[PDB]
Design a protein around this nucleic acid. Structure first.
Lengths: 82, 100, 115, 100, 136, 126
RNA sequence: GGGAACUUUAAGGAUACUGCCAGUGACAAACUGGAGGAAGGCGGGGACGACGUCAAGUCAUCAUGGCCCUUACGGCCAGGGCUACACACGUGCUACAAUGGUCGGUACAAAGGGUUGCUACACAGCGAUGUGAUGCUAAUCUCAAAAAGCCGAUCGUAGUCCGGAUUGGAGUCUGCAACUCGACUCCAUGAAGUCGGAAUCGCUAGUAAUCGCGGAUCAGAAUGCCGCGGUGAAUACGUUCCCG
């Protein structure tokens, strides 16, 4: 994991979007390719469409997912069995 | 290698050289202990806001003659094929077949 | 002797016997014994009832068997419900920490299943 | 209390020996005392180069390159000593470092 | 080989008893180059047999080795002198491995005493080879 | 008084022989203090024991390189050479014992394509 | 202080030639034994691979005849994949323990790397590491602790004080960024595994076996590869059959 002395990593373009939405109260999803951004407490209550390689999967941020990377909720491989 | 890949490598070296000084300055400001926490946070933000190609970790050593990205041998600056050719021709000073 | 609802061996050294409890390892056994002032080489059967009571009082500070097993169960269940990548791996009973699955996943996958 | 320290580095021990002999002879001729030459341990670098262009891992050439070092000490240097040493020619393939 | 005859590799006598027999026994006992451990194992047995019953350590070992020595191969053939000792040492090592005691040295000494008195998996195996020899 | 140099497996021993009661020092240490295993101690004492002069001489020995066995062999070789220097008439006996020969055996280099000097990777024709 | 003896460092030389003796061979080439010598008959190891064979391998190192695309089969970018997983095979590492595990004390190497680097020492932390600071462009300072070994104690044959997979919870470092998909540290957990069928592989001596150390690639990322030393065996009667 990222060192604690550096703090959590969030992309600036995504952070500005969530900050604008929270300053306002827009409910439309925020579309992003930033799978590597960490979910912050401010993220709670928002819908983020995370790119998974080919599509944008919507994720509704609940309190329990604070501290996860955004990409953990958008799987990138397809598998159903053999 | 392809001309596009060689030109990509050249452009990356150019960007690293262009942004070398400011990156070092921001890293020093981050490492500063006498600096304010807000100052170090702003330095980190600017470092993350720098262009990606400014980072030296994205450079890949390529053969100075052909551009091959495997088997580089930092000391000679040539990949293994051209190194073998040049050594066996005798244009590399001091290098001889090794036996012991 | 019965400690934390477990019958730990009587003929072994205390530092080894105390690791028979779930949630206690060698380091934790050393820490427990050092804080009640019992040498590590004393066997459990050579212990006074007050010494065993002190050991029980010390063990109560560490989550040991039922609380620990329930805590691990809730931790796994939370991921499985949340549906994150680790939860999906837990559902499929596949390696969770990035190991290869093309070969050598037998600990998580169990014995081989013929086609 | 002036002592001249000369260090010779080369890839060819015959060349380094010739240069050391020349320096010692010149210093002895100029009427100065000389200690050396002292042979320092040699550096050997080895490389394994695949010879086939595509796939033969057991088919490689093993090359080596050696760095030879010699040390020369001049004590009680006469006036003509320094001028003679500076007038001495620099042979290609031998690096000469002088310390006072 | 095929065309050559390889000269036998002469091993030095042990530095304590100057006995090539004990040195060869140590070589048979030793595993993956750990000579000192095998030395301890063999010397412990040699000292312990002396305490248990007073004989010369070399002489007692030689007598027991002669007792365990076979004389027939397998089509019958007699064993050459070298293979007699070579096969007795292996049998005495293998059989002494399986008796239960605290140290390997004590097991080795115990079966040395046992084979001196005619009981041991070694001389059962010797009599089994004798049976198979009588078979043909 | 007399000097000898012994070599065995990258181990070199300098031996200084004199006339004395039997004192023996290796690297400012006693023989028992320096060598842990009995056979190393016995190999060092082999030449003087053979000559029956264990109490006739005093030894000052230093040694560097190699391991315990190599150092013991080097010390024995150096003692033999020092005895040869002290008296040339002792050479036939020591050569008969075999102490004069320098053991030239050395570690063989690893070779390209092999796991070791001789060991080869496992082969599968199937 | 001092010395130039010894070890070593590394350039140049000497020595080994069946040279001497004995026996055989055919009265030849050769062959067996002995002395001296550090070494004796090719002392050990490396490099060096004839004429040719397999339309063997490589148009993806590179070069090149011919064919094909040209708002695309060219070029730029972000995210994903090369890391998937009912399965089968090859090459390895670690084990199944007492010739061992753990704890305490105490010895002995070689080779190689270091200025965008290696770091003495002190402080903080259980630790990975962090901060301050010092020497080094290196036979000068450093990586660095060799490990197996020896001495003492304990474990007493148990799936164990063996084994260390997997999973839960905390961290560190590199990096713009460790979700997919890094390495390492601490606590907890403690899987299979009781020496492995038919069959099959390596090795003739400082070899096999076993123990540790270094490097190339490289920001980070070796159980692979290329090297280094430590301890140090067993067996070769012979060519009847297996293969070439």
């Amino acid at each position: 994991p990222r060192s604690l002395k550096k703090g959590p990593f969030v992309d600036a373009h995504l952070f500005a979007k969530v900050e604008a939405a929270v300053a306002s109260n827009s409910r439309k999803p925020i579309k992003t390719w930033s799978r590597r951004s960490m979910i912050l407490p401010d993220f709670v209550g928002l819908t983020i469409s995370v790119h998974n390689g080919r599509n944008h999967v919507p994720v509704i941020v609940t309190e329990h997912m604070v501290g996860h990377k955004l990409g953990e909720f958008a799987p990138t491989r397809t598998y159903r069995g053999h | 290698a392809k001309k596009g890949m060689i030109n990509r490598e050249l452009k990356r070296e150019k960007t690293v050289a262009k942004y070398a000084a400011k990156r070092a300055e921001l890293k020093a400001t981050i490492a500063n202990v006498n600096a304010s926490d807000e100052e170090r946070f702003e330095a980190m933000l600017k470092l993350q806001a720098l262009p990606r190609n400014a980072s030296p970790v994205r450079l890949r050593n390529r053969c100075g003659l052909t551009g091959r990205p495997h088997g580089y041998f930092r000391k000679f600056g040539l990949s293994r094929n051209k190194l073998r050719d040049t050594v066996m021709q005798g244009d590399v000073p001091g290098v001889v077949k090794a036996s012991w | 002797a019965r400690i934390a609802g477990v019958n730990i061996p009587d003929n072994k050294h205390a530092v080894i016997s105390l690791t028979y409890i779930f949630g206690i390892g060698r380091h934790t056994a050393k820490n427990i014994l050092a804080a009640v002032g019992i040498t590590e080489t004393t066997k459990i059967r050579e212990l006074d009832d007050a010494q065993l009571d002190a050991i029980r009082a010390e063990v109560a500070k560490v989550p040991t068997e039922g609380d620990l097993r329930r805590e691990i169960s809730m931790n796994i269940k939370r991921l499985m419900d949340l549906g994150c990548y680790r939860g999906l791996r837990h559902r499929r009973s596949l390696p969770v920490r990035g190991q290869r699955t093309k070969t050598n996943a037998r600990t998580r996958k169990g014995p081989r299943k013929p086609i | 209390n002036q002592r001249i320290r000369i260090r010779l580095k080369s890839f060819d021990h015959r060349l380094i020996d010739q240069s050391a002999q020349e320096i010692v002879e010149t210093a002895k001729r100029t009427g100065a005392q000389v200690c050396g030459p002292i042979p320092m341990p040699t550096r050997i670098e080895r490389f394994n180069v695949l010879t086939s262009p595509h796939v033969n891992k057991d088919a490689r050439d093993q090359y080596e390159i050696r760095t030879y070092k010699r040390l020369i000490d001049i004590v009680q240097p006469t006036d003509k000593t320094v001028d003679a040493l500076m007038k001495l020619d620099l042979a290609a393939g031998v690096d000469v470092q002088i310390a006072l | 080989p095929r065309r050559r005859v390889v000269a036998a590799r002469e091993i030095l006598p042990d530095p304590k008893f100057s006995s090539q027999t004990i040195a060869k026994f140590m070589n048979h006992v030793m595993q993956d180059g750990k000579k000192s451990i095998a030395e301890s194992i063999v010397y412990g047995a040699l000292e312990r047999v002396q305490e248990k019953n007073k004989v010369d350590p070399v002489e007692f070992f030689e007598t027991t080795l002669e007792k365990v020595r076979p004389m027939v191969e397998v089509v019958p053939m007699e064993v050459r002198p070298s293979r007699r000792t070579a096969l007795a040492m292996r049998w005495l090592v293998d059989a002494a491995a399986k008796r239960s005691e605290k140290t390997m040295a004590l097991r080795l000494a115990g079966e040395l005493l046992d084979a001196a008195e005619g009981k041991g998996a070694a001389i059962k195996k010797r009599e089994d080879v004798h049976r198979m020899a009588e078979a043909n | 008084t007399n000097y000898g140099t012994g070599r065995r497996k990258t181990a070199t021993a300098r031996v200084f022989l004199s006339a004395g009661t039997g004192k023996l020092v290796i690297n400012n240490r006693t023989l028992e203090q320096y060598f842990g295993r009995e056979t190393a101690r016995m190999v060092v004492r082999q030449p003087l024991e053979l000559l029956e002069a264990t109490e006739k001489y005093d030894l000052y020995i230093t040694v560097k390189g190699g391991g315990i066995g190599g150092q013991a062999g080097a010390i024995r070789h150096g003692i033999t050479r020092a005895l040869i220097a002290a008296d040339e008439t002792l050479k036939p006996v020591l050569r008969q014992a075999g102490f004069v020969t320098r053991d030239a055996r050395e570690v063989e280099r690893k070779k390209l394509g092999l796991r070791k000097a001789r060991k080869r990777p496992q082969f599968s024709k199937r």
